[PDB]
Nucleic acid binder design. Sequence first.
RNA 1: UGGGGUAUCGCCAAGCGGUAAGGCACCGGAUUCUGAUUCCGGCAUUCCGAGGUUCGAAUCCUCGUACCCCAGCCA
RNA 2: UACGUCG
RNA 3: CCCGCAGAAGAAGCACCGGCUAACUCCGUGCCAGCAGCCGCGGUAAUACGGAGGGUGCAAGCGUUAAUCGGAAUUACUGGGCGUAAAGCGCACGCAGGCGGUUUGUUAAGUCAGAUGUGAAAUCCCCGGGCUCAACCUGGGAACUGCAUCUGAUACUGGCAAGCUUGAGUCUCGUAGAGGGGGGUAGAAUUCCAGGUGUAGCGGUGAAAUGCGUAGAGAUCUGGAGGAAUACCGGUGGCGAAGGCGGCCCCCUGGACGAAGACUGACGCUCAGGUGCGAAAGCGUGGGGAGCAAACAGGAUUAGAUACCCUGGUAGUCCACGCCGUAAACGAUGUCGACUUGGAGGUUGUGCCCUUGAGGCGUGGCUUCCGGAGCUAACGCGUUAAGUCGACCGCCUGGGGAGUACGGCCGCAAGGUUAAAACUCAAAUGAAUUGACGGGGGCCCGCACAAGCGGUGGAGCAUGUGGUUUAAUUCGAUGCAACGCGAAGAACCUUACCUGGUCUUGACAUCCACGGAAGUUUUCAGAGAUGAGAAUGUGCCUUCGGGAACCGUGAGACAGGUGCUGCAUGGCUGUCGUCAGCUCGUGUUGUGAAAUGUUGGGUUAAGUCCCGCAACGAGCGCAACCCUUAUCCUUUGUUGCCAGCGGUCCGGCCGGGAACUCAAAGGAGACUGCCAGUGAUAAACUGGAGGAAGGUGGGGAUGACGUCAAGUCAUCAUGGCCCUUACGACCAGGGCUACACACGUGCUACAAUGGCGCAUACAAAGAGAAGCGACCUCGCGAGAGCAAGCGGACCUCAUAAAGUGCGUCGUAGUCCGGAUUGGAGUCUGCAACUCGACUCCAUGAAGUCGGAAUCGCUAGUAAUCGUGGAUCAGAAUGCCACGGUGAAUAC
Length: 206
Amino acid sequence: GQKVHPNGIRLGIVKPWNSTWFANTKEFADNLDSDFKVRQYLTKELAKASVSRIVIERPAKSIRVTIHTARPGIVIGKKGEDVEKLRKVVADIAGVPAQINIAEVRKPELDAKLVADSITSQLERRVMFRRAMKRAVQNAMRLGAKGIKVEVSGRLGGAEIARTEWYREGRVPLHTLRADIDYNTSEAHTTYGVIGVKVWIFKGEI
RNA sequence: UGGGGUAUCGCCAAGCGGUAAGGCACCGGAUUCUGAUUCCGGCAUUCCGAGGUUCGAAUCCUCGUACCCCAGCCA
RNA sequence: UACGUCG
RNA sequence: CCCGCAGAAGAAGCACCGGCUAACUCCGUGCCAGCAGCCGCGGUAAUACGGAGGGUGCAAGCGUUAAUCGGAAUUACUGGGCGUAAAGCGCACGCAGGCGGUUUGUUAAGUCAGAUGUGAAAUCCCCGGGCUCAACCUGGGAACUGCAUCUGAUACUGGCAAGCUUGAGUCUCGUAGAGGGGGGUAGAAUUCCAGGUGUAGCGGUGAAAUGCGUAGAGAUCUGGAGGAAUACCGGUGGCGAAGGCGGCCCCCUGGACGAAGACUGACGCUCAGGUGCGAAAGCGUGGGGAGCAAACAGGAUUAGAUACCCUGGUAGUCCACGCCGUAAACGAUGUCGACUUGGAGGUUGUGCCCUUGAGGCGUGGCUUCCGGAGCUAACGCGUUAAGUCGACCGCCUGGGGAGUACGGCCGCAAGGUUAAAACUCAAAUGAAUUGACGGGGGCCCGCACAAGCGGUGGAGCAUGUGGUUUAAUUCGAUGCAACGCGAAGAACCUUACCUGGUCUUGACAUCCACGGAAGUUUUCAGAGAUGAGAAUGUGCCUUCGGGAACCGUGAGACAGGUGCUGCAUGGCUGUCGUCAGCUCGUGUUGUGAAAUGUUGGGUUAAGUCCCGCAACGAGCGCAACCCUUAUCCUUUGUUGCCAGCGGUCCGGCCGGGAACUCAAAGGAGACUGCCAGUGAUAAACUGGAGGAAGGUGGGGAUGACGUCAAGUCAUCAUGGCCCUUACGACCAGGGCUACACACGUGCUACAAUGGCGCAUACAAAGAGAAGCGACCUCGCGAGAGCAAGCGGACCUCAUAAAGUGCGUCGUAGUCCGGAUUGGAGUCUGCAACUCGACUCCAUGAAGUCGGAAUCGCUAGUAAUCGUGGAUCAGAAUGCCACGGUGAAUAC
């Protein structure tokens, strides 16, 4: 087990943080756990909506949750009853007056959360993994994407030993720190157990 | 049955009446991935059992035990 | 295990 | 056989389903039961076992077994092989056998053509015919591949007769040669013997010892004897059928090759049995015996050493005659002949040309190296074939058993030769590829070794582990990469363990139905929760049947599990290793596994970079981008700073100043950029200047493809299995702290480079509200009381300590060392007995520099000195950080 998380080593360099509140030591743990609850809830209740990121920020006793998603229409719905329902329950969880926004992730096959969730969904619909991976690399390289690597792992095809079998195309410069590597990871709970899907997407060199 | 010999650390084997020496083993450490080899340290038998002489017995004397050797013949 | 492919 | 009757009515199994081989899942079993033709399945999710569902193949059959042929070109006549897979006799001579150049004539035996007789019938085959069809029966033909006789043909083969020269042989003349046998001789050297000189070692080895030596060795000189071998020439040189043959000379003798010419005229090639020759060792008889040397003996080495090494040493090696009859007797390649591109040599002839020299042009014989086509599994062979053919011989038929046993023949014997079987395995083998490995080779690196400094192993204690104990001593981690590791902190809690007491839809969920707002202070029993009471209950809506929140009660569906499996998993981690590597696309090469690229010449920290190159490019990695540190500039200047000012309670203390330290943001800076030299004028290297810094400046982060079925199911998630009045839950007490022992990692020591007392100087980095907690008072002290200030460059923790200056101690188990133990306390916490931390008084072990062994470090490093933080109510000698002083050494 030996590679650094390629989001974490780029946190001040190119990648931003998904939480951008300041807090002293008295409420740092409380704000942090409140963020675990709103991302847990808001991740479970938008499983069909293809959600990429949820960014929390707290401007002066009020949360401001931004849902980067690929299907904004299914998040908002017929006149946005679903949004006001979500800020009602996020205001229930965080205990502050909640705002909520939706940012449309166009080009959803270049986002690693959406790619890993895609391949994970296909693996738990019992399709063969080489199609899922290989299709994901092809259609991601089709639109921009100066590199992509996907990597499934663990008891693939229902075996009794676990393999990995990664694929990559293009250039994925993972030790370069100015590389805009969009990396994310999902787990596929199949009837044989968990299958881990990692995906790195190299977008640009700065 | 008689004569001679032996009995001393777990094993083989030195001990001169005032102290128990050697090797193998065993115990601890080290070398080594681990074991053997190796290296460094240790321990250890109040001496077959009983009685006696002596200031003092593994040592000397007597008896018993256990095991060896030699003889047990001429008719 | 284990390699059998589409609008 | 035909017609009528009644009604789908009387009528489907067997094998197989992992691959071969058509046809798949579930359940049971868990290296068992069992299956199987071969490969092989079965040790918990088995398409292979047993059952079921489903399917597949055949069908009044279907499977198994036995037997034959096929596949099997694995006995090869069609139709195989033999350098290395099994297989070329050790080499020749040669009989019987097989084969035989060229021309003409005759024959016509083989060969061919036709005819005749026969080749029984049935059967097979073809065209028809009859049973409703088919099987079956049957008509006619074809066929029976043969044999015999007669008639012809005469190209090939054979017979016969005659020839001919291109095959084979004879003669003439020379050439080279370690060809053979017999005889003689010569020179160096070794050993021995006799003698001279001379004196303390010689010999031997990795080191030694045995051995020889003051009875005079070894060294050295002279004389002698004897035996064997023949330096230099000496050469992938020569000769020989092969084995083999090495001074020089003589005698007897075999073959080869060349030049011109003559002669014979197919006299040739191969060869089973047969015969001969046949290294070395060995055997017999008789000699010889210097060296060397099986056996043997001694010395060593070693765990042992019947060995390698040393010192001796007999058979043997040498000669004569006889035997044996074999070798990796090997070009692992039978003999003879023919044809098929080349190059460089060697050796031995011969012809021609100015031989104008150690030349030029040819033509033979033998031989070496490399290569073309071709062949070959590949490796390689390649006009001396393993190419393209012909003749004859020998041999092979999976590995082992076994070239063995029995029998025969041979042999003095040792043994040789010929040559099986039972049984057993599903491989054995060849060549080549990728890797790994090597006590193989070349180049290169790292505190790897070396050069040093300080440790560990010895002592006491701390902490972890193994073991032992226990009611339990919870579980996990175990070479490196487990062992102050998970645990950044076990009194209760944590806690998972043990002993008891208890609960069962539950401590934690969601959904019901009923009742009641919840909540708040009380008392009794017991270890807590269960029970008994008093107030408060309406927090807002409901054609009232209820809903918001919370608590009891009842059934459940469930909840719960730190239970098992890290060898079913994810995620996260260690490690080789921050080692420089790991690959891919397209192209090409190879039958192919694969190769190339990626290797080679340099260079680099680096598959770094240049150059070359059947490669051209690309990716992950290296480098850079990131953080920090080292210098300067700009901005802002509080709480931070004080150079110049003013006075000053002399303290940045105040007014004030924004220069400086500093703070933090933004820039500059270092890139082999410049110079000289060396280098493929290339990469680069070495040196120099400037500069705070010089060549990835220092440090960190960053850890490629993969390896260890490495670690974790106990952080979490998770497949399957398992418990679900219990393996779940609550509680109190205990344990995780036990202690004959052993190991790991640390701390403190053994002191004078120090101990103690007094004074005194210089830090950095941090933390802080249920917190850090000044000042002041009390206490010897740990601390206590009152209590400012500070959520913080402002206040507090908080005095840095080693250092320095004085005094003392004086080499003592001591004024070292502090363990251990008694007493007295402080704090935290419901609670310090098991089982805290600290203080005071007293006690004052072991220990005087640590055996074998072992570890860390290359410069602000090691060493040494303190300070802070996380976890935490309290508990660090650990961990993570911070600064002070500050080395040695690298050939």
